[PDB]
């Protein structure tokens, strides 16, 4: 039926017809997510005993490393974790350039003032997050260890500039007095002092807030989550992702000798014939696992309806439609042939399979595969002083068909 | 010193990180032209541009520091790439620290918002070839140490110039300077097309510059 | 496989081009069948497989350099071995090399049968039953065919045999020392090897797209624009495949004219 | 009409490519048929005549 | 020079199409060499003047 449909006809003549192609599917994929590499020291900015205040932070400008947001996301040690417009898990996939962390302690209830969007009175004087902020803000009522110095901004007139560092503490009320006179009647220190003792309530307790604003994408990109590294599943058609090189094949053991700076193995044309895994630094030979062509050998439709199936360049074990590996399976140089019986007798070629192997319909009737015979085996009797003279003749009328012309066809292009 | 000299067939690095066995591969990249005129600078510490790339060489084993001061303004206005070697480290600090008018850690006298600061093992008769380039914010350094007998200038040979280290930087280097009986050579990379011959080992044992002559 | 390597997104975009891929395959299959027909037409002229005589009393004619060598594993004459020595895991992108229907051992048997028929009978084995004749008498028929009388060979048999042996001996030296000795066959080999190399090297071209890898397009970009980039890649690779198929068709038409001349020279000069 | 000239362009390109492919294959087949006809004429002159 | 007449931008854009111009040049050079060989095959039969 496949032969009938691929020819768009209800009747097929005798011969080999290529119906569809064959390809071994990949069993699995191999990435095996990467190393420890250089880790981002978020623990230093989180577990800081000498936590700073909101007027002056511990400005930690962190650079090329892997920041495992999943580590801080699967653990509920901190009270609240927020990250701008990104789920923490995918935070390990889509990455950025560099990060900057500011750590501070605030007074309880006013945790919501610090926000890229909605405003707050504290954010109007202490620290305002950028309007286009994209980072990670972690806040928790630590208390105990950091509770027993801690003074917070209370005297300003403009919101702090997006991503700005201000530590001003000059005494003034707003602008009304022409001369402030140090501390006249109301011009106290802008850094108002508060009680950070355990007796304080939840809304008046030290709240550790750390912002983790990462710079947007530029020409380089260094602070990225887990990517790279591989493994080995040898002698199997698999998908592999080797350091960004993605492809399907068999990763056999190889005797190649890469120089200790090369990873890929593109040899001749532009195909990758070898690879280096960045875990054991060994060389793996990439090979197309298996493919070929399914060909149907059929002795016509009028004669019979039985067929044989030939797979072009695959082994007889690699073939798994209906029955394709049980009995009547013969491995010739031209591939694996099923549905045909091997006969030692050599006849004239009927259906050319290849490499000297042909197939035919013969006895009930079946499909036989044999080695074609070059012709009748004549014995040549050379002998000097001996000749052979014909004593009779035959008048033979043979036929010779020769095409002369084809159908004249015109096409109106428009 | 405005003295010139012939670079012969030196100054060809590995354009990529791909193994190749008995493949004659044509690569279009910023290569040092064959038989080009490279400037021989003797002690001296001149100021030299960068343009597209820089080639460097050393002759004797005096080992007089030989750091580098790749910059773009070098006056505390933009990030500047400084490499300092002390026989134990290769400290690469990209930062806007203000180098004095005649640099020679007292090279600079300030500390700006210093970014990525890679530090690792040191890499620096004995010819010492270096190639520095920057394409898309990635500072690439290639190096090769080879033994030869000093006669007058760079010898006639072609070893490998294997790659050394790539750094993600993102700045632009439009100028550069050398840190320090000085004797070195400077060449300039050009966007040429080279036919590189690979042996069984994946080593570039020969090269042809397809602009030098009709042959 | 060549245009859209194991990418269902690309393969679905190749369905709207109709039977562009079912036609190149048909052309290539026709070319392969034509190559098989050429090989069978040149060599498989006579079907009777005459055996090489196990003697050397050919009137002084040597024939050792053209008759098959029984000692060596392959049953090939020294000249055939020299000619075979002179001429010099599957491919990744769906390119396969089907084996010829007539193996090199089978063609050698055809050549040996033709040689044995020529030595045995002469031209009579190609026009009916093979009628044996002594070789000195057969060469007197061929001398008689060029306007020279019979007695010229019989009275100069030793000299003619010596000249024949010397010429056949010098044939090997002339074949093994000329630089472009088997230049025609080597050019036939090289033209197809460079065509496949150029075809597979066209898979690393953008053709206007952002990248030459379908995985990069499918991952980096959204599906709506990945469709456009993949369509550009499809157009480029389909054009490359069409160019390869057309060039192979022209080259096969050129080769078929050389196989219709080798078959004519076999009938009119060997037979 | 402004947006109908981009799909029609794709149709035109595809149909032109199909026509060119057909014409090229027919030219090669016509060359083969011409060779066969030359052989037939040679056989008519040499053997029938 | 035919597709992109002395235009560097057009040449850079054409460089992305791979070895197409190289194939065309190779084919035309082969045609020219064959044309030179035809005359030698026809007229240069005997090389004694
Ligand atoms: C037909 O001609 C072939 C050569 O084309 C003759 O074979 C040659 O036989 C001679 C005599 O045996 C060999 O010469 C000697 O061979 C060995 C090995 O070198 C050694 O004894 C001597 O140094 C001397 O060279 C000669 O090598 C050999 N040639 C070949 C190619 O095998 C053959 O005898 C002739 N047939 C006849 C006369 O029936
Ligand atoms: C990444 O980690 C792997 C293991 O997960 C490291 O592979 C080591 O390779 C050496 C040989 O080079 C083996 O002897 C070790 O057993 C492996 N390590 C371990 C922990 O099993 C690999 O070096 C790491 N790559 C880095 C850090 O870049
Ligand atoms: C040559 O062969 C022909 C046949 O090809 C012989 O003629 C046959 O003779 C037999 C016996 O008399 C008859 O039965 C047949 O009918 C004849 N055939 C034809 C076609 O006429 C002929 O005898 C043979 N000649 C010699 C001299 O042996
Ligand atoms: C980065 O590259 C650009 C492009 O060349 C530089 O732009 C010009 O560079 C020259 C010399 O460096 C300056 O004198 C010009 O003023 C620049 N033109 C303008 C208007 O941008 C740029 O200077 C480089 N970056 C730095 C900081 O040197
Ligand atoms: C460079 O090539 C040489 C010569 O081919 C290599 O030396 C051979 O190495 C192989 C195994 O790689 C040994 O079987 C041979 O005995 C070696 N031959 C000699 C003469 O030493 C050499 O190893 C290669 N360099 C590498 C791989 O770094
Ligand atoms: C299996 O494949 C190998 C490697 O190609 C081949 O040598 C062998 O003959 C095949 N065996 C069978 C049983 O098909
Ligand atoms: C064909 O010959 C082989 C090899 O001797 C033998 O094993 C096999 O049984 C024979 N097959 C038949 C059908 O006679």
Domain count, chain B: 1
Residues of A in contact with D19 (CB under 8 A): 411, 413
Q: Are C136 and C153 in contact (CB under 8 A)?
A: yes
Residues of C in contact with A2 (CB under 8 A): none
Angle, helices D4-43/C223-265, rounded to nearest 10 degrees = 10
Please state, as a whole number, how many other Cβ atoms lie within 10 Å of the Cβ of residue A365: 11
Residues of C in contact with E20 (CB under 8 A): 243
CA distances from B50 to B10, B56, B172, C239 (A): 19, 12, 10, 43
Documented resolution in Å: 3.1
C134 lines ligand 1 (CB under 6 A): no
Pocket test for ligand 3, best of A389, A391, A392, A393 (most atoms within 8 A of CB): A392
Domain that holds residue B205: 4-215
Strands B184-187, B37-41: parallel, antiparallel or unpaired by DSSP?
Answer: antiparallel
Torsion of CA B65, B68, B74, B75, to 10 degrees: -20
d(CA A236, CA C90): 16
Instruction: Locate A79 and state its tokens.
Output: 């009270």
With an 8 Å Cβ cutoff, is C240 touching chain E?
Answer: yes
With an 8 Å Cβ cutoff, is A401 touching chain D?
Answer: no
HSE (CB half, 13 Å, CA atoms) of B172?
5
CATH code assigned at B156: 2.60.120.960
Q: Which long-range contacts (CB under 8 A, 24 or more apart) does D22-28 make?
A: D22/A411, D24/C246, D25/C27, D25/C249, D26/A409, D28/C249, D28/C250, D28/C253
CA distances from B132 to B80, B95, B174, B175 (A): 15, 18, 12, 12
Q: Which ligand is nearest to the CA of A346?
A: 7
Interface test with C, best of A275, A285, A384 (most C CBs within 10 A): A384
Of residues E17, E19, E23, nearest to C207 (C-beta): E17
Q: Are A181 and A188 in contact (CB under 8 A)?
A: no
- Chain-chain contact of C50 with A354 (C-beta, under 8 angstroms): no
Handedness of CA A323, A329, A334, A340 (dihedral sign): negative
∠ at Cα A17 (A16, A18), nearest 5°?
120
Give Cα A96 to chain centroid, integer Å. Answer: 19
Read off φ and ψ for residue C248, nearest 5 degrees.
-65, -35
Q: Give the H or E element holding residue D41.
A: helix D4-43
Handedness of CA C108, C109, C110, C112 (dihedral sign): positive
Terminal-to-terminal C-alpha distance of chain A: 39
* SS3 annotation, chain C: CCCCCCCHHHHHHHHHHCCCHHHHHHHHHHHHHHHHHHHHHHHCCCCCCCCCCCCCCCCCCCCCCCCCCCCCCCCCCHHHHHHHHHCCCCCCCCCCCCCCCCCHHHHHHHHHHHHHHHHHCCCHHHCCCCCCCCHHHHHHHHHHCCCCCCHHHHCCHHHHHHHHHHHHHHHHHHHHHCCCCCHHHHHHHHHHHHHHHHHHHHHHCCCCCCCCCHHHHHHHCCHHHHHHHHHHHHHHHHHHHHHHHHHHHHHHHHHHHHHHHHHHHHHHHHC
Burial A240-269 (b: 16+ CB within 10 A, else e): bbbbebebbbbbeebebebeeebbbbbbeb
User: How many beta-carbon pairs below 8 A join chains A and D?
Assistant: 23
- For ligand 4, the distance from its centroid to the CA atom of residue B50, given in whole angstroms, is 13
B127 Cβ contact list (under 8 Å, min separation 6): B57, B58, B59, B145, B146, B147, B148, B154, B155
Burial A306-319 (b: 16+ CB within 10 A, else e): ebbbbbbbbebeeb
A261 lines ligand 5 (CB under 6 A): no
DSSP code for B4: E
CA distances from B181 to A60, A180, B5, B45 (A): 44, 66, 18, 11
HSE (CB half, 13 Å, CA atoms) of A157?
5
Q: Is D26 left (phi over 0), alpha (psi -120 to 50) or beta?
A: alpha
The residue written with tokens 């362009």 in the block is D9
Of residues D14, D18, D28, nearest to C253 (C-beta): D28
Please state, as a whole number, how many other Cβ atoms lie within 10 Å of the Cβ of residue C78: 15
Strands A366-371, A341-342: parallel, antiparallel or unpaired by DSSP?
Answer: parallel
- Chain-chain contact of B203 with A221 (C-beta, under 8 angstroms): no
Closest Cα in chain C, distance from residue A379 (Å): 6
Strands B53-58, B126-134: parallel, antiparallel or unpaired by DSSP?
Answer: antiparallel
d(CA C215, CA C224): 15
The residue written with tokens 């990109």 in the block is A221
Q: Find, in chain C, the residue whose alpha carbon is nearest to that of E18.
A: C205
D18 Cβ contact list (under 8 Å, min separation 6): C18
CA distances from C77 to A22, A394, C64, C70, C119 (A): 41, 37, 8, 9, 15
Read off φ and ψ for residue B139, nearest 5 degrees.
-80, 115
With an 8 Å Cβ cutoff, is E24 touching chain C?
Answer: no
- Chain-chain contact of C99 with A270 (C-beta, under 8 angstroms): no
Which residues on neighbouring strands pair with residue A81, listed in sequence order? A138
Angle, helices E21-43/C223-265, rounded to nearest 10 degrees = 10
- Chain-chain contact of A378 with C200 (C-beta, under 8 angstroms): no
Which residues on neighbouring strands pair with residue A153, listed in sequence order? A191
Instruction: Locate C131 and state its tokens.
Output: 């009628």
Last residue before each gap in chain B (C to N over 2.5 A)? 42, 104, 124, 180
∠ at Cα A177 (A173, A181), nearest 5°?
80
- Chain-chain contact of C23 with D28 (C-beta, under 8 angstroms): no
* SS3 annotation, chain A: CHHHHHCCCCCCCEEEEEEEEEECCCCCEECCCCCCCCECCHHHHHCCCCCCCCCCCCCEEECCCECCHHHHHCCCCCCEEEECCCCCCHHHCCCCCCEEEEEEEEECCCCCCCCCCCCCHHHHHCCCCCCCCCCEEEEECCCHHHCCCCEEECCCCCCCCCCCCCCCCCCCCCCCCCCCCCCCCCCCCCEEECCCCCCCCHHHCEEEEEEEEECCCCCCCCCCCCCCCCCCCCCCEEEEEECCEEEEEEEEECCCCCCCCCCECECCCCCECEEECCCCCCEEEEECCCEEEEEEEEECCCCCCCCEEEECCCCCCCCCCCCCCCCCEEEECCEEEECCEECCCCCCCCEEEECCEEEEEECCCEEEEEECCCCCCCCCCCCCCCCCCCCCCCCCCCCCCCCCCCCCCCCCCC
CA distances from A372 to A338, A353, B142, C42 (A): 18, 10, 62, 17
Q: Are B3 and B39 in contact (CB under 8 A)?
A: yes
* SS3 annotation, B132-169: EEECCCEEEEEEEEEECCCCCCCCCCCCCCCEEEEEEC
Q: Find, in chain E, the residue whose alpha carbon is nearest to that of C233.
A: E17
With CA atoms as reference, report the closest residue to A95 among A264, A198, A248, A223: A223
Q: Which ligand is nearest to the CA of A280?
A: 2
With CA atoms as reference, report the closest residue to B94 among A63, A82, A17: A63
Torsion of CA C54, C60, C64, C65, to 10 degrees: -150
Handedness of CA C1, C3, C9, C11 (dihedral sign): negative
∠ at Cα A189 (A184, A195), nearest 5°?
125
DSSP code for D47: I
Q: Which long-range contacts (CB under 8 A, 24 or more apart) does C32-36 make?
A: C32/C98, C34/C252, C34/C256, C35/C100, C35/C252, C35/C255, C36/A352, C36/C100, C36/C101, C36/C102
Which residues on neighbouring strands pair with residue A360, listed in sequence order? A368
The residue written with tokens 């901004």 in the block is A153
C62 lines ligand 1 (CB under 6 A): yes
Give Cα A181 to chain centroid, integer Å. Answer: 68
Q: Are C106 and C74 in contact (CB under 8 A)?
A: no
Instruction: Locate A251 and state its tokens.
Output: 């990763």
∠ at Cα C120 (C118, C124), nearest 5°?
60
Burial class (CB in 10 A: 0-12, 13-18, 19+), A49: exposed
Read off φ and ψ for residue C203, nearest 5 degrees.
-85, -5
Q: Which long-range contacts (CB under 8 A, 24 or more apart) does C214-217 make?
A: C214/C4, C214/C5, C214/C7, C214/C9, C214/C10, C215/A246, C215/C7
Closest Cα in chain A, distance from residue B62 (Å): 29
- Chain-chain contact of A222 with B23 (C-beta, under 8 angstroms): no
Strands A335-338, A341-342: parallel, antiparallel or unpaired by DSSP?
Answer: unpaired
Please state, as a whole number, how many other Cβ atoms lie within 10 Å of the Cβ of residue A237: 20
- Chain-chain contact of D40 with A402 (C-beta, under 8 angstroms): yes
């Amino acid at each position: 039926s496949e032969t009938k449909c691929t020819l768009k006809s209800f009747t097929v003549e005798k011969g080999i017809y290529q119906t569809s192609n064959f390809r071994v599917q990949p069993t699995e994929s191999i990435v095996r997510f990467p190393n420890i590499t250089n880790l981002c020291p978020f623990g230093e900015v989180f577990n800081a005993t000498r936590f700073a205040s909101v007027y002056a932070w511990n400005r930690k400008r962190i650079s090329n490393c892997v920041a495992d947001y999943s580590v801080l996301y699967n653990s509920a040690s901190f009270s609240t974790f927020k990250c701008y417009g990104v789920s923490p898990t995918k935070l390990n996939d889509l990455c950025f350039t560099n990060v900057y962390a500011d750590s501070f302690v605030i007074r309880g209830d006013e945790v919501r003032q610090i926000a890229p969007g909605q405003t707050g009175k504290i954010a109007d004087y202490n620290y305002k997050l950028p309007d286009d902020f994209t980072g990670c803000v972690i806040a928790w009522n630590s208390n105990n260890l950091d509770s027993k110095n801690y003074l917070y901004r209370l005297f300003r007139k403009s919101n702090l500039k997006p991503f700005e560092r201000d530590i001003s503490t000059e005494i003034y009320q707003a602008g009304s007095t022409p001369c402030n006179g140090v501390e006249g009647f109301n011009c106290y220190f802008p850094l108002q002092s508060y009680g950070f003792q355990p007796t304080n309530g939840v809304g008046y307790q030290p709240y550790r807030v750390v912002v983790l604003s990462f710079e947007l994408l530029h020409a380089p990109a260094t602070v990225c989550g887990p990517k790279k590294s591989t493994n080995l599943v040898k002698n199997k058609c698999v998908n592999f992702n080797f350091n960004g090189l993605t492809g399907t094949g068999v990763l056999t053991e190889s005797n190649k000798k890469f120089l200790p700076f090369q990873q890929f193995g593109r040899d001749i044309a532009d195909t990758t014939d070898a690879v280096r895994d960045p875990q054991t630094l060994e060389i793996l030979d990439i090979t197309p696992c298996s493919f070929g062509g399914v060909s149907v050998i059929t002795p016509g439709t009028n004669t019979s309806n039985q067929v044989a199936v030939l797979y072009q360049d695959v082994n007889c074990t690699e073939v798994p439609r209906v029955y394709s590996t049980g009995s009547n399976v013969f491995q010739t140089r031209a591939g694996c042939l099923i549905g045909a019986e091997h006969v030692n007798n050599s006849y004239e070629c009927d259906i050319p399979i290849g490499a000297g192997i042909c197939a035919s319909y013969q006895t009930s009737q079946s499909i036989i595969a044999y080695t074609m015979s070059l012709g009748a085996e004549n014995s040549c009797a050379y002998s000097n002083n001996s000749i052979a003279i014909p004593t009779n003749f035959t008048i033979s009328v043979t036929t010779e068909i020769l095409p002369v012309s084809m159908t004249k066809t015109s096409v109106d292009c428009t | 010193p405005p003295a010139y000299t012939n670079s012969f067939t030196r100054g060809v690095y590995y354009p990529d990180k791909v193994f190749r066995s008995s493949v004659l591969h044509s690569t279009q990249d910023l290569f040092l032209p064959f038989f080009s005129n490279v400037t021989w600078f003797h002690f001296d510490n001149p100021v030299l541009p960068f343009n597209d790339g820089v080639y460097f060489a050393s002759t004797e084993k005096s080992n007089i520091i030989r750091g580098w001061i790749f910059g773009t303004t070098l006056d505390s206005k933009t990030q500047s790439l400084l490499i300092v070697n002390n026989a134990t480290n290769v400290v690469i600090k990209v930062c806007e620290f203000q180098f004095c008018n005649d640099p020679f850690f007292r090279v600079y006298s300030s500390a700006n918002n210093c970014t990525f600061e890679y530090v690792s093992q040191p890499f620096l008769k004995n010819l010492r070839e270096f190639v520095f380039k920057n394409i898309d914010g990635y500072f690439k350094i290639y190096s090769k140490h080879t033994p030869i007998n000093l006669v007058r200038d760079l010898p006639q040979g072609f070893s490998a110039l294997e790659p050394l280290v790539d750094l993600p930087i993102g700045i632009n280097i439009t100028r550069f300077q050398t840190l320090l009986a000085a004797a070195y050579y400077v060449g300039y990379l050009q966007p040429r097309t080279f036919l590189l011959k690979y042996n069984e080992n994946g080593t570039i044992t020969d090269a042809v510059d397809c602009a030098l002559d009709p042959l | 496989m060549y245009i859209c390597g194991d990418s269902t997104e690309c393969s679905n975009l190749l369905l709207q081009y109709g039977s562009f891929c079912t036609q190149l395959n048909r052309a290539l299959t026709g070319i392969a069948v034509e190559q098989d027909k050429n090989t069978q037409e040149v060599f498989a002229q006579v079907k009777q497989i005459y055996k090489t005589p196990p003697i050397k009393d050919f009137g002084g004619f040597n024939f050792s350099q053209i008759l098959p060598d029984p000692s060596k594993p392959s049953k090939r004459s020294p000249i055939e071995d020299l000619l075979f020595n002179k001429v010099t895991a599957q491919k990744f992108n769906g390119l396969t090399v089907l084996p010829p229907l007539l193996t090199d051992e089978m063609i050698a048997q055809y050549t040996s049968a033709l040689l044995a028929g020529t030595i045995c009978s002469g031209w009579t084995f190609g026009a009916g039953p093979a009628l044996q004749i002594p070789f000195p008498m057969q060469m007197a028929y061929r001398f008689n065919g060029i306007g020279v009388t019979q007695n010229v060979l019989y009275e100069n048999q030793k000299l003619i045999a010596n000249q024949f042996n010397s010429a056949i001996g010098k044939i090997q030296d002339s074949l093994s020392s000329t630089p472009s000795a088997l230049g025609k066959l080597q050019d036939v080999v090289n033209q197809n090897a460079q065509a496949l190399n150029t075809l597979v090297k066209q898979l690393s071209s953008n053709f206007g797209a952002i990248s030459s890898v379908l995985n990069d397009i499918l991952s980096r970009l959204d599906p709506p624009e990945a469709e456009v980039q993949i369509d550009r890649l499809i157009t480029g690779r389909l054009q490359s495949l069409q160019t390869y198929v057309t060039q192979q068709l022209i080259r096969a038409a050129e080769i078929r004219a050389s196989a219709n001349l080798a078959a004519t020279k076999m009938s009119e000069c060997v037979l």
